[PDB]
């Protein structure tokens, strides 16, 4: 496979896109270090939470590919827990080639109506939590000496801010900037850093209830959420997003660092 | 008198660019609500801090333009302080036409070498603090019913992330997103929201030794910091930045909302 | 006035936006060199053409501002005619401070359905014609030695390409590039170069029959043409576009070169 | 292989990037239609031209992959030649799945110093010739009814214009626009359209002598041409660009349409 004998570290791997990346990267030959908070993060995040069962199942799916999975329940806002998982992973697998910084949360409210808890939770998990993930993994990837590839999961909202979630758009634009700063800073080490910007991926993060409420109260907001030109009905799958991550993780994308890749089937073109 | 009889609320107004905006908007006719921490923000911010004398100085300069100045020492991370200043300001002036969210801080370190204090300070002042400023002022502007103009001070690093300051670049990209989400959400209220992206402005924030050290350690980082094509030697002034803020604040820029204006004499073109 | 004693050269000045710039820059104190083809460009351009009477009217409006107008019927694709008008303008006024490259045409068709005529006309007037305008005017501005400001009229379709007019979108993206290349090349001469990107300006170019037909045949294209957030009904006026041009033309925008200014009341945010 | 039983049409296939794409897509299992002017395009293009022999070598390299090659000497500016090659191609192969519009030329000069020959050659080949290529191929792809993937070769200068070649930067920005217009127009047909933006690729197009002449006269222009952060010395190869084209051509990129992919090893981040 394109990743035979390599090792990837993936956050938010309990379900959804994170699980898809873990399984796909395993299918490509990588052993997997995977973590997820496996719990509701906040009263302000109103869709269904991931469970520890979900993470165990990612691990079974990785093992089904003939690979090894080290999994752990942790919060990416918990620096000590991240350091320890990285250390345990390096002891078990001995190298670190791919990082997928994927854990995130979403909530909704107009900028001046957002609460402290809404703000702090989204900025804290999405932006600070990603930074902590990067700070914990980068030294191990440098020390391993094999170069590497880091994929930061931003959002289409990380390139074009959307109404009703300025805190989420801010967190995700912040991720675009981290990706690009880190691409410059890690160039000399042979480590590439790129970001993906998905749209309309069918996971529990998309709460149809929340969207209907937003468009009910502010009908003009619909103009920020158009159909996808090459798939004008319904949603893309988490596995489809994993096609992009697999390619970025491997040598086929050796010419890309600092790129913002929209995974949106054309929606950002409208 | 492009702003005759109007009221502007400005953060970080003790000195530097914030001072220049206060005095200019005053000379255009606006009375001024202005605030600043007037103290060191963090050991991690190594250049000289502003003083309470600086903010009194801004107040006197505004008064010399024939206008009123309400000033206060507060931290933009202190929500109650912000709310109280907005309330006292509305009591005194009865309207709010312009917000210039200008308070900010800078420090330097590669992404994986940043400390919790460096990160938390930059994200908390620049991103969260700006959000708190917007949340505290937007409802007064809506209630006044005269529409208005909000200027968010981002940076050239909020459009093109730079090496050695990923936290700062993230904070300022986050501000780009806040500007654009807010522009959409406030359009129906007749309030325009735009961001400026300065480069090389002569204020204490760019005392040169930090940058000298960064380049000495990481020589390749110089490529991210080119000359300004229309001023290839030296620095732009804080009063030059206030020309742009003055035009965005007033009606001459009525066709602009959601725009990112580089104030860089062309440096972003390189 | 902000442009007192200065001289501006404006193309497509017979009506619409170009007329509004001519009259506005005259009100600011500038003398005006104004030109327009005053004729239908092509059978492929289906809205009403400008007439010589239109250009004489622009001249009368300039003269009512107390300023002088040199006007000339010419085609921006005609190099000799451009060179001759620049020369006559320098003989009359002895200087050249502002250039507004505004002449433009529009037609509609899907990429693979466009005719040679449709393509050649739009590329030829918009992209090549603007280039000829800059080549003919830039040497005179340099020679005069007072620095200057050049405004290139692109479109929102010069930043975000639209369906049904790939030729026009390509021409206007070409103008964004020309603006930026020229800004770098002219920096050393003290000449600023910026582009404006309007949307939904009420001129004959936007007679609604063509757009109505495009939408009826290709209904999904409607997603590319959202409302303006701060003006969700109707169109902006040519005089409103002239507010931005006037500011760019003068010293208040001395910190801007190489900037792309959307004049769209927020529409590109959606 | 990923493109087994499919057909790809490639322009500029005599050598350099175009040859790399033809041989790679053949290795993935596609039969090839390939064409090239195999002659000097213009006195204004000063580096060595491709030869008919170059194109025959490409054909052999395709046949070595065990695939069929239909090749033809033609100018992409020549519409009848394109239609006839497309027609012969469909008769021979029966379908058309991938188009790589790669033919291009480069020359150098400041905007107001460019000759008519310089301008007309670069716009005619790069912008108009690419348009003609798309207009000739898109109908055949639609009629075949299998969807498809179209790759437009722009340049880093199609994202960030460069000094000394405003005409080339304009032509390549125009290609960005064509890509995105076409992505919206072709979505309903299951045809994806994406653009690549390479930098520093080792082909005859990079003439060390012309660069040295440019920097000799205008030293400040060097700031637009930085090193590649993940390959700070030397050039990337044509085969490395072909990794990106092979991925875009195939189903692994099914989530991408309207994307601008920089192929620059990070250079655009500086
Ligand atoms: N669903 C979409 O349409 C969409 C679009 C663009 C971007 N995104 C982003 O994609 C990424 C994956 O989201 P998803 O769609 O699979 O949704 P999801 O909610 O199903 O998956 C996110 C996972 O992250 C975990 N997580 C949340 N906070 C965490 C924390 N503090 N520490 C550790 N783990 C945490 C969750 O438990 C969950 O398992 C997220 O970053 C999200 O913002 C989603
Ligand atoms: N100087 C530059 O080159 C440059 C370039 C681009 C952007 N910026 C941005 O411009 C803005 C103004 O900075 P400047 O150049 O005038 O530097 P400065 O340090 O001279 O001024 C910033 C002011 O903000 C105040 N401030 C900092 N943290 C605060 C807090 N928590 N609460 C209240 N006040 C606080 C400071 O006391 C100071 O008076 C900042 O947002 C900065 O990030 C500066
Ligand atoms: N109307 C809009 O909504 C809109 C939006 C974005 C950009 N634009 C651009 O604004 C600019 C001004 O257009 P407008 O809206 O005022 O439309 P308009 O057609 O009323 O004005 C354009 C003027 O350019 C002149 N012209 C056309 N081809 C010429 C040529 N070859 N040589 C000399 N003159 C020529 C015309 O005769 C006409 O007077 C154009 O470049 C157009 O592409 C318009
Ligand atoms: N080399 C670089 O660094 C670089 C960087 C960015 C983009 N590009 C672009 O990549 C593409 C490939 O260029 P390359 O680097 O392989 O250079 P190249 O000159 O080796 O290849 C270009 C090929 O296109 C052919 N061609 C030129 N004009 C033609 C016409 N009118 N009709 C048919 N064929 C024609 C040439 O004969 C040549 O074989 C071009 O579009 C170029 O602009 C190159």
Numbering used by the authors:
A (entry chain A), B (entry chain C), C (entry chain B), D (entry chain D): 7 to 276
List passages from the publication reporting this PDB structure.
Here we present a series of TIGR03971 SDR crystal structures from several mycobacterial species which contain an insertion in the primary sequence at the NAD cofactor binding site. These crystal structures demonstrate that the inserted protein residues almost completely cover the NAD cofactor, only leaving part of the nicotinamide ring exposed to solvent. NMR experiments did not show exchange of the NAD cofactor, whereas binding was demonstrated for a number of small molecules which could be potential substrates, products, inhibitors, or artificial redox partners. Experimental results are consistent with the notion that the SDR family enzymes linked by comparative genomics studies to mycofactocin do indeed keep their NAD tightly bound beneath a protein structure that may interact with a specialized adaptor machinery for redox exchange.
With the exception of the M. thermoresistibile target which did not contain NAD, all other mycobacterial SDR target crystal structures contained NAD, which appears to have co-purified with the protein after expression in E. coli. For each of these crystal structures, the adenosine mononucleotide portion of the cofactor binding site is enveloped by the inserted residues and only a portion of the nicotinamide ring appears open to solvent (see representative examples in Fig. 2A and B). In addition to the insertion loop which covers the adenosine portion of the cofactor, a second loop which typically contains two α-helices covers much of nicotinamide mononucleotide portion of the cofactor. In contrast, this loop is ordered in each of the mycobacterial SDR crystal structures presented here. The combination of the insertion loop which covers the adenosine portion of the cofactor and the ordering of the second loop which covers the nicotinamide mononucleotide portion of the cofactor results in a significant decrease in the solvent accessible surface area of the cofactor in the mycobacterial SDRs, relative to other NAD- and NADP-dependent dehydrogenases. Only a small portion of the nicotinamide ring appears available to solvent in each of these cases, indicating that the NAD cofactor is tightly bound and potentially non-exchangeable. The structures presented here have a cofactor solvent accessible surface area of approximately 18 Å2, whereas other NAD- or NADP-bound dehydrogenases have a cofactor solvent accessible surface area of 82–89 Å2. Given the encapsulation of the NAD cofactor by the two loops in mycobacterial SDRs, a large conformational change would be required to release the NADH cofactor after a redox reaction had occurred. Alternatively, these structural elements may not allow for exchange of bound NAD/NADH with free NAD/NADH.
